[PDB]
A and B are shown apart, each in its own frame.
With several copies, the nearest count.
Chain A
């Protein structure tokens, strides 16, 4: 259905056994993304 994939496509070993890849056009890793937490001290009161 298509002859050449042009998209962000990570190189693995399983898929590499059925296709031929090329040299990567970008190097990247897998970093966890989390929602940024806004700092705010609790300090219920001066009585604490």
Chain B
């Protein structure tokens, strides 16, 4: 056996057989934390056009 951080692959599947995956692996994206805006149209917001 080869328990570890082994990613299931098509090429590896035809030379060795794997088990049911216990951890999901994909292709993700990082980014720095966003500070956050303040809805630049905020001044007309705390009311309604009817009011």
B-binding residues in A (CB < 8 A): 11, 21, 23-24, 27
Count residues on chain B whose CB falls below 8 Å from chain A CBs: 4
B8 to chain A: which residues have CB within 8 Å? 23
A24 to chain B: which residues have CB within 8 Å? 21
A-binding residues in B (CB < 8 A): 8, 20-21, 24
Chain A contact surface mostly: loop
Minimum Cβ distance to chain A for residue B47 (Å): 12
- Check if B20 sits within 8 Å of A27, measured CB to CB: no
Can you show 6 pairs from A to B with CB atoms below 8 A apart?
A11-B20, A21-B20, A23-B8, A23-B21, A24-B21, A27-B24
A11 to chain B: which residues have CB within 8 Å? 20
